[PDB]
Amino acid sequence: VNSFSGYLKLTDNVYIKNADIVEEAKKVKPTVVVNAANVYLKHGGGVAGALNKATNNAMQVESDDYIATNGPLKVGGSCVLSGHNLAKHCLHVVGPNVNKGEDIQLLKSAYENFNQHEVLLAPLLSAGIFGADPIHSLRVCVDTVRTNVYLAVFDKNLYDKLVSSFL
Ligand SMILES: O=C(O)C(=O)Nc1ccccc1
């Protein structure tokens, strides 16, 4: 049994809810929240900007030190950093950004990072300002992630479209 409430069950392991991931993280304090990161961990907008704002910029300070030591992530890659006031840990995952011309086949690689964690609160990778089709992102998630994932979709129309169209 876990703390997650109000989710629709899509599969054995994937759950979905219309929710603000920031507000959901603050309520649940999950072991892992996933960030929709870029390779530079520059948390300017979208999910990343919202998560970072909720940490009062502490996520960005920590991220800048990580990049100064390790250099940029790979598209499709990830790193584990603090969850600050939102979660125990933040898994920063880089999905391909279609608005930069990145290979959408890298979306499966991105979701494979989730399999290193038994339970996660996450957004749909490469959705929103990353430019991918969220329907496609949900299909790759279901067909790639084997651990227990609680998805938060930001829009109410979008959520309803993802559920209605789910095979
Ligand atoms: O990825 C999401 O969770 C999301 O809601 N994307 C979105 C938001 C606003 C307009 C279109 C897509």
Curated annotation (Swiss-Prot):
It is found in: Host endoplasmic reticulum membrane. The lineage of its organism: Viruses, Riboviria, Orthornavirae, Pisuviricota, Pisoniviricetes. Changing residue 31 to A: In strain: Mu/B.1.621. It catalyses: Thiol-dependent hydrolysis of ester, thioester, amide, peptide and isopeptide bonds formed by the C-terminal Gly of ubiquitin (a 76-residue protein attached to proteins as an intracellular targeting signal). Residues 1-167 form the Macro domain. It comes from Severe acute respiratory syndrome coronavirus 2 (2019-nCoV). Inhibited in vitro by GRL-0617. This is Papain-like protease nsp3. It comes from the Viruses. Responsible for the cleavages located at the N-terminus of the replicase polyprotein. Participates together with nsp4 in the assembly of virally-induced cytoplasmic double-membrane vesicles necessary for viral replication. Antagonizes innate immune induction of type I interferon by blocking the phosphorylation, dimerization and subsequent nuclear translocation of host IRF3. Also prevents host NF-kappa-B signaling. In addition, PL-PRO possesses a deubiquitinating/deISGylating activity and processes both 'Lys-48'- and 'Lys-63'-linked polyubiquitin chains from cellular substrates. The chain holds residues 1025 to 1191 of 7096 of the full protein. It is a multi-pass membrane protein. May form homohexamers. Interacts with N protein.
